[PDB]
Design a protein around this nucleic acid. Structure first.
Lengths: 35, 183, 166, 196, 173, 125, 167
RNA sequence: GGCAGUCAAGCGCGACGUUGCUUUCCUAUCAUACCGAAGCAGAAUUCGGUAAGCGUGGGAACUGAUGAAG
RNA sequence: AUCAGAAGAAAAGGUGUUAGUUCAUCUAGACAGCAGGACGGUGGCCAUGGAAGUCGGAAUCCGCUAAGGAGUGUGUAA
């Protein structure tokens, strides 16, 4: 596994957060901001 | 001693300026700016040359005199002749993927020993890398700042760095062979 | 794995693309690496590294000298040998054999103690036949009867390293 | 030669242990000292020099109700306020009455932007330190230990300078008018023989 | 010092030599010894070192520079015969792919395992077989090309007065 | 622009009994001492250190180690005095020497001077 | 300060020795009571004439004949170390023999932490030729084209109004 | 490691050498993290380094609950 | 000095530092840096599957020169 301040569990996550959740969140708040 | 002087003749580059304690070295290829805070040394201009002087000091500061003389000369080589380096890849069974993006800044590398790890090699500011077309498995990276260019390929050498295996049998990998000027 | 069935196969398979450039730079970096390894090291491990360094400096100096020449309770707590026996000597503490080194021959050989001629500590110790440094002890010299003086303290050492008096 | 009722000491370029000793005497002298740009003070020795000399001070806490131990303050202002706290007899009635005459703040608040900012010529870095030496900046140092307000003050101080710069050109344009009017008064040139 | 004195003393005796008045690169040391073998020698030392010891000699000391030496074997052999040898640092071409040490003249020693690694040029030794212009005419002799021409078959090097005892007429021809 | 320590460099003694006298350097003996002279005979030739002197920008042509008369001979020809006075540096320091001989009534007469001068603020509005 | 003293002396003449020899020393001493004490120190270790035997005849000062001329002094020192063995040769560049030995003491007090009695100066000669000066830094303050900016600049009254120029 | 012998740095001994037998705290890591070196193809294994954070070689008024007051 | 500074370890180490002492060469060209030469008996005899200088054991001699070590390691089964 890894630890709290483990870069190995954090370096790949930043590349994993580039795709996946980030664009869906941008798609989530767009309709939320719509009146 | 009381003096330690070394002067290098300024070439036809656009700027050998050292004003405001900064190396604003501009040449024919472009303009480069760098901080001049390596050491408090006398950068004196004399016509078509720039003289580096370390007056009334010891060797601890005097040893750094030749570094700025080389650093400016290194900047002069990039301003006038530039830098162009070619790195050679080695593939045996699984070819290593390489994709130049953001005008060759974002290097999308994959399939290093068939690995699914996405290797993104972000280039240093001011350097453009490209896959050389003359020789297969060769990447040609060129730029003005050789220090940023050399450290980027070394980072690229540290990107797909082999680990957890015998270095003898597992020998194919990323290497640098050509390191020279752009002119 | 190595030279047998790997090296010649590696010759047909090629080596690393920078197998030579990495070694020479590391070879040149070693000339400056030994100073910080001598400066930043501390503790017993530094002295151990200094022990070999002092040995290497001595080894090179001898080689430099050679190359220049080439260019030219009542108990007995001490070791014993075996009313009047007021103290107690242990069976493990009693010693019967001793590493007897001849003075002229220089042969450090384990030999049995024929007897105890004289103990320099006390006559009661001589009566008890305790093992101590500098004591006169009878030793069989047939396989070499002779006396000997203990050149080493068998109490702190644990072994009766004695030199022949003859 | 100053007995102002209030002095403002701009602290960029000063040393810590030499300004804190100059100030500590003027506090006991009865003045009212304000030290602005305390964030841009200097300390002899390189960046890690005081860094372990203060990371060591973080390892020092009481072993009874550890919320009663030493209070290791992280602000650049309180770094220097600590320095003027051991220099004064702060356990007497004259120490704790002197300490409330000192106001040590970072940046420059507007109540002291529009006033004179004297400096100490006996504690300055460009004088008291050998050229080409190792020195660390407190406000650049204490940020790495917990003072999380670096990016705001460096932004805030940049706005104040250009506003003060705009103040200066109007002031600089003011005396260029009186530069003409000083010699235009003819009495200056024939009656300069009283030295003036 | 003594080695320079040994060459100056020998040159003084070579200046007192009988005749043949000889004043005479990229070739090997065997070429000089063979020239010494074809001489009843090969001894140059340092250029102008004997001139520093010797001090039309004044005009000869001005011309005393380069590779010269006294010998007595000749004139026709020096004028006509020039030894072919590899030069120091034509347009030699680099044969791509599997190459031979004879530049294609082998009717091909491609098993150069240590030399290819010592070359540093862009030639991949795939499956133990090396596979990739060696030089250019009218250009300076490149040292890397000189290292390549050392392995290649390029012998591109063809290796004035009579200081007589009674004549002593060192001509400038 | 940067000024240096030469032979024949004009200096100014800032800390000493001859404080404020224009003197010229003669020979450099060390990194802290030197040889210094001035044509004013009240200033004897002597070795000033650099901690109690301030350089001056004006330089003058002189070989090494001239005797005092030749220092005066080269001083009178290359007129260092009244070349120093042309500068704005001399204007303040000389006026510092007049504004300190000012008595009470003269320092009261300057009050009148600046009262005749203050109402000159009539300017191009 | 320092003051170089010419000292000569002898022992008490006896019937066996009607005329004692006279011994001259050129040494350095901040006053005269230490000169005639150091004088019996050197002469006791060399000539073995004790203080209970000898007498002192003449003390005079040697002012430097050319204090306005720059010079270079080669300095021979016998230094008494913690092993008591050092002969030392050192060069100083200044104007006066009085001033050199003060600087000689100061440097010797720093690098080798020598006290008063731990030093016995042996010989002081005004070395003159440029080819005999055997020090690199002394040689460089003696080239005709020498130059340097001022070191150690610093140009009461605390609370300066503006920034110092420091140029 | 000690005894005997040969040297010999050097100042009669002489160094490295050579010949004879005989709760919590602390890293000094026991695993986990990361690397270095090794006949280390891989697995597995050994050695070394950082590393005591957490796990599985040593040391030994305190927390609650109200409370006036610039 | 990456907690320097305001006897117990101490023998010794530093491509740490500043001053020095004694030696050598040095515009007959310092050291370095680079170009090139850097040879022939000979692959001496044993040593061996394979040892040509470089797995290795006594010599380790020589013609040649300014120079070549039965060879300084790298290196190949050689």
């Amino acid at each position: 596994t890894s630890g709290p301040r483990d870069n190995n569990r954090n370096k790949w996550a930043k590349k994993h957060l580039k795709k996946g959740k980030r664009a869906k969140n941008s798609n989530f708040s767009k309709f939320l901001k719509k009146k | 001693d009381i003096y330690k002087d070394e002067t290098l003749t300024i070439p036809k580059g656009v700027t050998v300026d050292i004003k405001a304690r900064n190396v604003t070295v501009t040449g024919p290829r472009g303009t480069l700016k760098q901080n001049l805070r390596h050491v408090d040394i006398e950068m004196k201009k004399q016509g078509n040359t720039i003289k580096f002087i370390v007056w009334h000091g010891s060797r601890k500061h005097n040893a750094c005199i030749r570094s700025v003389y080389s650093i400016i000369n290194n900047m002069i080589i990039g301003v006038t002749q530039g830098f162009r380096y070619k790195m050679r890849l080695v593939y045996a069974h699984f070819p290593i993927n390489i994709n130049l993006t953001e005008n060759g800044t974002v290097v999308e590398i994959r399939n290093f020993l068939g690995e699914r790890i996405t290797r993104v090699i972000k280039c240093l500011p001011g350097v453009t890398v490209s896959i050389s077309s003359a020789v297969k498995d060769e990447i040609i990276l060129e730029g003005n700042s050789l220090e940023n260019v050399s450290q980027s390929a070394a980072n690229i050498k540290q990107i797909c760095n082999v680990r957890n295996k015998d270095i003898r049998k597992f020998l194919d990998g990323i290497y640098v062979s050509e390191r020279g000027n752009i002119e | 794995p190595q030279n047998e069935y790997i090296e010649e196969s590696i010759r047909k398979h090629g080596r690393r693309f920078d197998h030579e450039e990495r070694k020479r730079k590391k070879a040149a970096r070693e000339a400056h690496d030994a100073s910080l390894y001598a400066q930043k090291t501390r503790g017993i491990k530094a002295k151990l590294y200094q022990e070999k360094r002092r040995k290497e400096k001595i080894q090179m100096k001898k080689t430099i000298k050679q190359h220049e020449e080439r260019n030219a309770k009542r108990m007995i707590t001490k070791a014993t040998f075996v009313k009047y026996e007021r103290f107690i000597r242990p069976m493990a503490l009693r010693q019967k054999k001793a590493n007897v080194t001849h003075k002229e021959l220089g042969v450090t050989m384990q030999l049995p103690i024929i007897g105890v001629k004289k103990n320099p500590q006390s006559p009661t110790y001589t009566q008890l036949g305790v093992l101590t440094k500098g004591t006169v002890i009878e030793v069989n010299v047939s396989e070499l009867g002779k006396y000997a003086q203990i050149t080493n303290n068998p109490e702190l050492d644990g072994c009766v390293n004695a030199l022949l008096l003859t | 030669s100053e007995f102002q009722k209030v002095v403002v000491i701009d602290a960029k370029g000063h040393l810590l242990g030499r300004l804190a000793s100059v100030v500590a005497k003027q506090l006991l002298g009865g003045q009212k000292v304000v030290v602005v740009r305390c964030e841009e003070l200097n300390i002899s020795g390189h960046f890690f020099r005081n860094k372990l000399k203060y990371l060591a001070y973080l390892r020092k806490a009481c072993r009874y109700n550890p919320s009663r131990g030493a209070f290791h303050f992280r602000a650049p202002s309180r770094i220097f306020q600590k320095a003027v706290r051991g220099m004064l007899p702060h356990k007497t009635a004259r120490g704790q009455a002197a300490l409330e005459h000192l106001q040590a703040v970072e940046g420059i608040p507007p109540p002291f932007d529009k006033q004179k900012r004297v400096v100490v010529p006996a504690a300055l870095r460009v004088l008291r330190l050998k050229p080409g030496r190792k020195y660390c900046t407190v406000g650049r140092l204490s940020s790495e230990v917990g003072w999380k307000y670096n990016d705001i003050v460096a932004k805030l101080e940049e706005r104040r300078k250009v506003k003060s710069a705009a103040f200066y050109q109007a002031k600089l344009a003011k005396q260029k008018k009186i530069a003409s009017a000083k010699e235009a008064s003819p009495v200056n040139q024939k009656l300069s023989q009283f030295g003036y | 010092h003594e080695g320079k004195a040994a060459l100056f003393s020998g040159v003084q005796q070579s200046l007192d030599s009988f005749d043949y008045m000889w004043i005479f690169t990229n070739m090997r040391n065997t070429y000089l010894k063979r020239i010494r073998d074809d001489w009843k020698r090969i001894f140059m030392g340092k250029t102008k070192v004997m001139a520093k010891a010797l001090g039309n000699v004044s005009k000869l000391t001005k011309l005393l520079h380069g590779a010269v030496g006294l010998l007595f074997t000749v004139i026709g052999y020096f004028e006509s015969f020039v030894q072919n040898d590899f030069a120091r640092a034509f347009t030699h071409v680099i044969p791509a792919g599997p190459v031979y040490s004879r530049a294609g003249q082998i009717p091909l020693t491609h098993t150069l395992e240590p030399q290819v690694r010592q070359l540093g040029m862009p030639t991949v030794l795939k499956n133990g077989v090396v596979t990739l212009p060696l030089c250019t005419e009218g250009q300076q002799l490149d040292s890397r090309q000189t290292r390549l021409l050392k392995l290649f078959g390029i012998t591109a090097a063809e290796f004035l007065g009579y200081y007589s005892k009674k004549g002593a007429s060192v001509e400038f021809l | 622009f940067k000024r240096y320590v030469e032979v024949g460099r004009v200096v100014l003694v800032t800390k000493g009994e001859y404080t404020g006298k224009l003197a010229v350097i003669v020979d450099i003996v060390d990194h802290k001492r030197a040889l210094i002279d001035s044509p004013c005979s009240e200033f004897p030739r002597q070795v000033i250190r650099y901690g109690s002197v301030v350089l001056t920008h004006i330089v003058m042509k002189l070989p090494r180690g001239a005797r005092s008369g030749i220092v005066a001979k080269k001083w009178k020809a290359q007129d260092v005095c009244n070349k120093w006075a042309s500068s704005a540096w001399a204007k303040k320091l000389e006026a510092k020497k007049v504004r300190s001989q000012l008595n009470d009534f003269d320092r009261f007469a300057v009050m009148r001077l600046k009262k005749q001068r203050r109402e000159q603020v009539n300017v191009a509005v | 300060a320092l003051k170089e003293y010419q000292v000569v002396g002898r022992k008490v003449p006896t019937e066996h020795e009607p005329v004692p020899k006279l011994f001259r020393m050129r040494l350095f001493a901040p006053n005269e009571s230490v000169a005639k004490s150091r004088y019996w120190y050197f002469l006791k270790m060399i000539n073995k004439v004790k203080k209970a035997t000898g007498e002192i005849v003449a003390i005079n000062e040697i002012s430097e004949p050319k204090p306005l001329k720059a010079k270079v002094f080669g300095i021979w020192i016998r230094y008494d170390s913690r092993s008591g063995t050092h002969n030392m040769y050192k060069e100083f560049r200044d104007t006066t023999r009085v001033g050199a030995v003060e600087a000689m003491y100061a440097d010797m007090a720093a690098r080798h932490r020598a006290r008063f009695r731990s030093i016995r100066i042996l010989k002081v000669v005004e070395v003159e030729k440029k080819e005999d000066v055997r020090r690199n830094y002394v040689k460089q303050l003696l080239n005709p084209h020498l130059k340097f900016p001022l070191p150690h600049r610093r140009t009461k009254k605390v609370f300066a109004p503006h920034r110092p120029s420091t140029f």
